[PDB]
């Protein structure tokens, strides 16, 4: 992906994080587990929801064909009518298919971005109080108990304290 | 002791297309095209049609 996180330096996703799209896995002396970053997650849900509704709604006004009939000596205008109706169907078919392709690409990249930013958010808190392992993980120099871990997820990680 | 960043995966086989890649497996997708019909001529909002038959 464009942002290098998903299927990049973070090799794979987590079956074990069920509760959100992005989040944290912690590991210390007390144990280990997954925790979803709900805010980043809810941001993503609002964006994707709006997108879908934007797509659905933009295609709201669109060409509606009507039945028109013509006799045996009106072949020219019958052909015109047919070319006209087919022409608009092809145009709207193109618009729909291309919009889906373009916005699918942007949706996948959007998720990649949200992950990259969540990773950097944590990196920028910890700074040189942890080893950046290069795989999505940060190994602490100090012991980091569950409250310590929570403060990382908080945005509250007190850097001067360590 | 360590903390790691990651993302959701699941058992989904739903696929979507993009410009640069086709058949990308995603965790979730939403179909927006109705493909089926009941194969019958019906009352429209309760008001029966005029069926001229032959």
């Amino acid at each position, epitope marked *: 992906g464009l942002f290098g996180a998903i299927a990049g330096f973070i090799e794979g996703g987590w079956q074990g994080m069920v509760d959100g799209w992005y989040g944290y896995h912690h590991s210390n002396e007390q144990g280990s*587990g997954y925790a979803a970053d709900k805010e980043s997650t809810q941001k993503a*849900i609002d964006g994707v929801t709006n997108k879908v509704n934007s797509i659905i709604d933009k295609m709201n006004t669109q060409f509606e064909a009507v039945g028109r009939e013509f006799n045996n000596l009106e072949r020219r205008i019958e052909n015109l009518n047919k070319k006209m109706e087919d022409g608009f169907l092809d145009v709207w078919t193109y618009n729909a298919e291309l919009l889906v392709l373009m916005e699918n690409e942007r949706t996948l990249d959007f998720h990649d971005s949200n992950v990259k930013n969540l990773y950097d958010k944590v990196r920028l808190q910890l700074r040189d109080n942890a080893k950046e392992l290069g795989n999505g993980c940060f190994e602490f120099y100090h012991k980091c108990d569950n409250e310590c871990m929570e403060s990382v997820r908080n945005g509250t990680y007190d850097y001067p304290q360590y | 002791d360590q903390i790691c960043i990651g993302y959701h995966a699941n058992n989904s086989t739903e696929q979507v297309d993009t410009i640069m890649e086709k058949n990308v497996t995603v965790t979730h997708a939403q179909d927006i095209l109705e493909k089926t019909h009941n194969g019958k001529l019906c009352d429209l909002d309760g008001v029966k049609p005029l069926i001229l038959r032959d």
Partner: antibody, heavy 128, light 101 residues
Framework: QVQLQQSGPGLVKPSQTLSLTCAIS??????????WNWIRQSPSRGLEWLGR?????????DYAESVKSRITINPDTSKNQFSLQLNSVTPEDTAVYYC??????????????????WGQGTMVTVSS | MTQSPSSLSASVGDRVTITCRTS??????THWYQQKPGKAPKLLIY???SRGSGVPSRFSGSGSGTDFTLTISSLQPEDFATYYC?????FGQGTKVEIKR
């Protein structure tokens, strides 16, 4: 429709182990679109989520911080049930215990922890 | 999660609104339950505003930032209950709706 049928004794002596079972019908304990939870309720403490188990290419458990050192929740894929075990009970563990399914209803495939089906409840009294 | 009021009396046909102020605002995680005495809770609303299966149209939910609301447009006798809001694994304390004389 999914039904959850609870069982287990409603009387536990102090310091001993509370043991409950939830038997599932209409769904699989190992379903990818289910999460299996225990929640308790007491007049004092209100509604309290205790823990869960679920299967996603392997079994996972999460437990509430308040009970983490005493609690075990195990699936049984032979009998399509899951259990609650709570060790070293005290009077404060007196409550109605409910099993409940979550993650059946998801926003964009993400379990939001919205419980959609609950068992009937087992009233548990800690007393000698 | 803080619910207000902790209880209320309203007559049949009344418009009823209950509020939950959450620690932090997420629309998708918030949910509402209705519990009648001695029964399990029933899911009423999920993700702030989606009606649960089999839940009648008089119930709706709204969310703005950290404030979430459940509204019963026209109270019926059967809506005597305690209503709870919830996010992630945290519940509000509940609101008792009694049917006021």
């Amino acid at each position: 429709q999914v039904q959850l049928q609870q069982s287990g004794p409603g009387l536990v002596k102090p310091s001993q182990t509370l043991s409950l079972t939830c038997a599932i019908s209409g769904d699989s304990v190992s379903s990818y679109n289910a999460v299996w939870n225990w929640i308790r309720q007491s007049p004092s403490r209100g509604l309290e989520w205790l823990g869960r188990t679920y299967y996603r290419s392997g079994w996972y458990n999460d437990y509430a911080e308040s009970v983490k050192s005493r609690i075990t929740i195990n699936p049984d894929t032979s009998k399509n049930q899951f259990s609650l075990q709570l060790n070293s009970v005290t009077p404060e563990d007196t409550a109605v215990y409910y099993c409940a399914r979550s993650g059946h209803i998801t926003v964009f495939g993400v379990n939001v922890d919205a419980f959609d089906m609950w068992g009937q409840g087992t009233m548990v009294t800690v007393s000698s | 999660m803080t619910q207000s009021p902790s209880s209320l009396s309203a007559s049949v046909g009344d418009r009823v609104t209950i509020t939950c102020r959450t620690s932090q605002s997420l629309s998708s995680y918030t949910h509402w339950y209705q519990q009648k005495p001695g029964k399990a809770p029933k899911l009423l609303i999920y993700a702030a505003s989606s009606r649960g299966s089999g839940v009648p149209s008089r119930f709706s939910g709204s969310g703005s930032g950290t404030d979430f609301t459940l509204t019963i447009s026209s109270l019926q006798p059967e809506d005597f209950a305690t209503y709870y809001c919830q996010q992630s694994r945290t519940f509000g304390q509940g609101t008792k709706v009694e049917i006021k004389r």
